[PDB]
Amino acid sequence: RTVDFKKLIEQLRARATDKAEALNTVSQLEIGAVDAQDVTASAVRAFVGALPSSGYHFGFVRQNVVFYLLSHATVQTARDPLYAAEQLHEQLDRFLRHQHDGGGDEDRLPFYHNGATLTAFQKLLQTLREIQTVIAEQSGGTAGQQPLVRRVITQLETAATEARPYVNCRAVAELLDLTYQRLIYWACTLMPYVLFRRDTDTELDTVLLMHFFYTHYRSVNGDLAVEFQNYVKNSVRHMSSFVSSDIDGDQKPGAEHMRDVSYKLFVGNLQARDASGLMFPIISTRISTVNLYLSPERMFFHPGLISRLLSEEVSPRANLDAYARVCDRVLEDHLHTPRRVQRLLDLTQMVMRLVELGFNHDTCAAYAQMALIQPASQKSSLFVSEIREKLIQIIYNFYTFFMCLYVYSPTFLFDHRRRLILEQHRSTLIGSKEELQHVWSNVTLNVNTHFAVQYTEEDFEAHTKGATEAEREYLYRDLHSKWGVHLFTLRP
């Protein structure tokens, strides 16, 4: 969204005698966005001069032009959030000083004022500065830890609750969304590996967890290779137990996708690749060896069984109650989570416990595509079909959660994008089918549960505590243009 407000100034002072034209112009300026660099002191001084009338909104911008301008300005287009924001800030400082020379008072409602707007905006600019500095310092530039992550997300939530009243401004909303996208993308991969290890794990379970960790997080964790190399030689009598002959390796279903993760452990170095497309011995994906050689809770880390269960090519004689009880437990645990909006710390905790389950966004998408690839009609028992539909439930709600988390923000823009995201995910996830009705209801409940942004009517009343009958109009119009819903009616 771009609008050249200089030509808008031309229109404003060309037809200054008409209030309707100025109202229309300021309306498309509000729905539009303006570059910060294009804004100087002379620019919006001429904006004020071009509309010297003060009818209702012209007067409103006479008192609070700064807040109105920052409610629609854009900064992200020029690749300079902090720099353009601070340039805008000092030119607005010049504006505030000019108005103070004209006259200064805390008129209307003290919650919002040009001086108050400048103070809040400079506080936000500072918080942006610490966000960038902590990102730079704790990422080691351009490429325990858990208490540090907890503390830093604590200062981020403190800055959020400081900036919580300021969410209905486009510039503030986009800055906050960018910061939160950066922080979430950083935290989703920077999770530690303490919880993977347990006594009941076998060699295969731990090595598979380590492959998932390597393919999920390798930025600054460089000690993995040596540990894996040592563990290969420590377990010399173990990998041969659950491996099949190379002659009948690739022919069995499900092992084709497992070959990528398998060759990493066979070669003896995660840095190696199967570029030649050679043939190597294949771990037996059959559950007869799986149950005897690994714990059922770590099955999602193992792509072969996911692919085979989704494909329904597993023999009915093969036992599958292990993953049945494991998946029932995890589904019940994750469904019982409260509908209340989890805090940012709570959101990070729930994300990291999801990552502990091995649900990687790329992995989830790449192994959920086959679910629609698999034929709808197949011969199967009751419990395997129940497992397949529960797999659809869990995998698809995880995929929707992750693809909405990457754009998650407690701002109106997140809902504005997420409505279309939900429509697209309905069109792709379900298509024209119907048997996905209940899973779709559960997915909608989850996405409206964990990612619910809430605006209080009392919050708007505080927003308009001192606002008279005039300022309600355009504030409500901006809220409707941003959120897209007639979310209240003002009847005092």
Binding site: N24, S27, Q28, I31, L420, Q424, S481
Partner: peptide
């Protein structure tokens, strides 16, 4: 209040194109 509806419909059309 008509041209704003024009612009919203155009933005929805662009979003459909992106989808």
């Amino acid at each position: 209040g008509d041209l704003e509806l024009q612009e919203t419909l155009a933005t929805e059309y662009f979003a459909l194109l992106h989808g």
